[PDB]
Design an enzyme around this catalytic site. Structure first.
Site, PDB file in Angstrom:
ATOM      1  N   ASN A   1     -10.555  35.292 -38.542  1.00 58.61           N
ATOM      2  CA  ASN A   1     -11.974  35.350 -38.866  1.00 58.61           C
ATOM      3  C   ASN A   1     -12.156  35.411 -40.376  1.00 58.61           C
ATOM      4  OD1 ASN A   1     -14.746  35.609 -38.800  1.00 58.61           O
ATOM      5  ND2 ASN A   1     -14.762  37.423 -37.475  1.00 58.61           N
TER       6      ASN A   1
ATOM      7  N   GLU B   1     -21.279  35.534 -39.570  1.00 57.35           N
ATOM      8  CA  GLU B   1     -22.150  35.566 -40.742  1.00 57.35           C
ATOM      9  C   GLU B   1     -21.489  36.307 -41.902  1.00 57.35           C
ATOM     10  OE1 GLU B   1     -24.726  37.805 -42.670  1.00 57.35           O
ATOM     11  OE2 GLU B   1     -24.325  35.898 -43.697  1.00 57.35           O
TER      12      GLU B   1
END
Ligand code: NI
Ligand code: NI
Length: 759
Positions: A209, A271
């Site tokens: 990630n 985000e």
């Protein structure tokens, strides 16, 4: 049974099994006939067939009689990449497919049938999946999943025809050892379970990630952290404007490519700001307008520019990029590439129907299929019935804002759906609890993604559960370990031909000490030192998700707690996990009485340090520098790849054994002694020599009146026992109490404890 045809299997068949004359019975005389290129995929069926028929003679071969597997490209148009035809006749069984994947799924169908009855009705069926990605997100993140757990999980998926797993995990880096904070996975270990996945047709997709949620990679790398206007960094966010930080990420991509064989890379792209604001990091907006040449470029533009750069980078490797949908943000001078797979989970931003219409390929990473150890989701609390029984739910129904549902109409752009397995708190549940927790949801998701919906003959979830879930056992090859090698009892613990293990506060290599093994329902052990009366645990050290992850962390003694319960679903009554699960240990049979000892939640091996082990954790962690290097002979926990130390666990040899039991279990203050409790302590001669002058000394305790004087047993003979009684009465003490008695016979010494509640 097996008639009606195919009514007790998961996923249900997508067309009707056409019956034919006769039957066929698996016996120890049959062979699994398959081309040599299919050998590794057929192996599972071969091993299962020997289990079912209670023998060992069945083999996979290129010729023989029994079950034939045929790979025929001519069938690609009729069967696709995953379809198969299963044909049963008196002469034998025939599985035909266009490729390995489809042939393997055929063996799962055959296996599930033979799992219930060795005799199969003759007939044929063609079976094909409704969706191409039938998936699981496994966050092997921050905390660790044992390789044995992963190995079992691939079998769980394979038998249900699930074929895609996104694994957010750390692969131990060759080029950046300072970022190798545990949890991590050895390169050889990943290669191994990736090889098994390849045989079972499972696409194992790695995820790092980025550029947020990078605490696990940037804790020790401050220069790659995005900085405040005050210059304050944060290990969560990589500085995407720093060229060496981009190089650092792309280097990890390279390292993974050598162990993962998938064509996909998942960069996450949750985000970037993680709820903050780009204005607190003005260097992002300035970086954007530089790479674009546009003065009005924004911080979000830099975020998207980063996504596109990684897209180009992995595409140059012939790979395809994947992102979470909350990474699709509003832009100005940079537009998101259109050749990226979007895994949709958040009911916000661009609608999934408009994304599909715009050409994107979508995975339904549905929030209704989420699992967490910390705060159970409704599917954990209530089971899948509320979804199965909802005709407005399905693989093509995505989540929308304000609790609305959005059906994606361009169905060809829906790759499939998956459930999600999140830790959130690494000690609230054990991994063995998770593997049980997800049992029902794995089957439900397998059913709706292969069949495209519920089986036609199971109107309600109760029917599906009664007729399929409760009837289809797991593959007999699912389990891969002795879950309870040693029975509950008293044991010693030592090194091979070395000192024993003792524990009082801290642990060390002692000599002559007793332990008590107590198995748990999730197949772990509590290790109770019978001298300190305290349990071996790991609670001190650097942590992630409330779990000790520091390498070389020092196990210590902790109050022994209840380890008789396990918690799944709603986890009703799950309290005390902070002490319970760090107290639990997996014991892996290493042969000849030796045992690998692995903590149940830190998943590091009880080890004896050597003074030559190297790791970043020995010098610093998350910007704070501190030396924790274990010295030679020190007891620590170590990842599997930094220790081979096993432990000799054997029932005790002591010539004496003492047991103390209280009656009543509760005591109350009394001036006449009526509220006293009789602690009968019983000494036993185990071996063959008359023991004499056995002295039993009672404890001394605040706020309790206890007999001050020791009692003595003149002699006890082999295989005999003697009993002495002490009386205890509380004065001002109230609550839980424990009484420890010391028994001494010559050079030998043992203890026996008892409990009394003071009321
Ligand atoms: Ni987050
Ligand atoms: Ni079990």
């Amino acid at each position: 049974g097996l008639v009606p045809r195919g009514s007790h299997m998961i996923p249900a068949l997508t067309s009707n099994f056409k019956a034919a004359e006769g039957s066929w019975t698996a016996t120890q005389g049959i062979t699994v006939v398959r081309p040599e290129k299919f050998a590794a995929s057929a192996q599972l069926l071969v091993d299962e067939l020997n289990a079912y028929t209670k023998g060992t003679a069945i083999k996979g071969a290129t010729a023989g009689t029994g079950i034939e597997i045929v790979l025929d490209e001519n069938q690609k148009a009729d069967l696709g990449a995953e379809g198969y035809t299963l044909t049963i006749a008196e002469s034998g069984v025939k599985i035909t497919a266009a490729a390995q994947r489809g042939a393997f799924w055929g063996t799962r169908t055959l296996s599930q049938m033979l799992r219930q009855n060795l005799t199969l009705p003759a007939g044929s069926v063609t079976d094909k999946p409704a969706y191409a990605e039938r998936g699981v997100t496994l966050c092997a993140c921050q905390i660790n999943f044992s390789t044995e757990w992963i190995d079992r999980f691939l079998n769980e998926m394979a038998d249900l025809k699930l074929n895609s797993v996104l694994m957010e995990m750390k692969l131990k880096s060759d080029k950046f050892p300072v970022a190798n904070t545990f949890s991590y996975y050895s390169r050889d270990d990943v290669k191994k379970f990736v090889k098994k996945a390849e045989a079972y047709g499972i696409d194992v997709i790695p995820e790092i990630n980025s550029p947020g949620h990078m605490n696990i990679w940037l804790e020790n790398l401050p220069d790659f952290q995005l900085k405040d206007q005050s210059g304050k960094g944060n290990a969560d966010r990589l500085d995407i404007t720093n060229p060496e930080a981009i190089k650092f990420y792309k280097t990890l991509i390279d390292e993974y490519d050598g162990v993962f064989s998938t064509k996909y890379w998942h960069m996450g792209a949750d985000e970037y700001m993680m709820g903050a604001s780009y204005y607190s990091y003005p260097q992002l907006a300035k970086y954007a307008q530089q790479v674009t040449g546009k003065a009005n470029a924004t911080g979000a533009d830099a975020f998207t520019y980063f996504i596109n750069d990684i897209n180009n980078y992995v595409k140059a490797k012939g790979k395809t990029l994947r992102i979470w949908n909350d990474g699709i943000v509003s832009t100005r001078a940079v537009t998101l590439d259109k050749d990226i797979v979007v895994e949709h989970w958040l009911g916000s931003g661009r609608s999934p129907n408009e994304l599909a219409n715009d050409g994107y390929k979508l995975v339904n990473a549905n929030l209704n299929l989420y699992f967490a150890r910390l705060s159970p989701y409704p599917i954990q609390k209530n089971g899948p019935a509320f979804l199965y029984n909802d005709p407005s739910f399905g693989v093509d129904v995505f989540q929308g804002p304000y609790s609305r549902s959005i059906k994606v109409k361009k169905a060809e752009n829906i790759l499939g759906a998956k459930l999600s397995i999140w830790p959130d708190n690494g000690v609230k549940q054990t991994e063995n609890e998770v593997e049980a927790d997800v049992y029902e949801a794995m089957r439900y998701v397998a059913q709706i993604t292969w069949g495209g919906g519920n089986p036609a003959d199971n109107p309600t979830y109760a029917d599906f559960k009664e007729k399929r879930v409760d009837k289809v056992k797991r593959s007999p090859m699912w389990n891969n370990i002795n879950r309870k090698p040693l029975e509950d009892g008293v044991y010693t613990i030592a090194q091979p031909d070395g000192k024993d293990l003792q524990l009082s506060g801290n642990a060390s290599l002692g000599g002559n000490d007793e332990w008590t093994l107590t198995s748990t329902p999730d197949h772990y052990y509590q290790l109770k030192n019978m001298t300190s009366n305290e349990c071996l645990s790991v609670v001190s050290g650097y942590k992630h998700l409330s779990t000790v992850t520091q390498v070389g962390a020092r196990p210590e003694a902790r109050p022994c707690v209840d380890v008789s319960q396990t918690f799944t679903g709603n986890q009703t009554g799950n309290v005390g996990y902070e002490e319970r699960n760090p107290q639990k240990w997996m014991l892996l049979d290493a042969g000849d009485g030796k045992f690998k000892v692995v903590n149940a939640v830190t998943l590091q091996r009880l080890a004896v340090a050597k003074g030559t082990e190297e790791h970043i954790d020995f010098t610093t962690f998350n910007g704070v520098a501190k030396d924790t290097k274990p010295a030679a002979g020190e007891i620590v926990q170590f990842p599997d790849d930094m220790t081979d130390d096993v432990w000799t666990i054997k029932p005790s040899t002591r010539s004496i054994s003492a047991i103390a039991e209280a009656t009543p279990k509760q005591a109350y203050a009394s001036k006449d002694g009526s509220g006293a409790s009789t602690i009968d302590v019983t000494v036993a001669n185990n071996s063959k020599e008359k023991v004499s002058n056995v002295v039993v000394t009672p404890p001394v305790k605040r706020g309790w009146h206890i007999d001050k004087e020791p009692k003595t047993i003149a002699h006890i003979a082999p295989g005999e026992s003697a009993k002495v009684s002490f009386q205890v009465s509380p004065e001002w003490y109230r609550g839980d109490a424990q009484f420890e008695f010391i028994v001494t016979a010559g050079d030998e010494v043992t203890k026996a404890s008892a409990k009394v509640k003071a009321i």
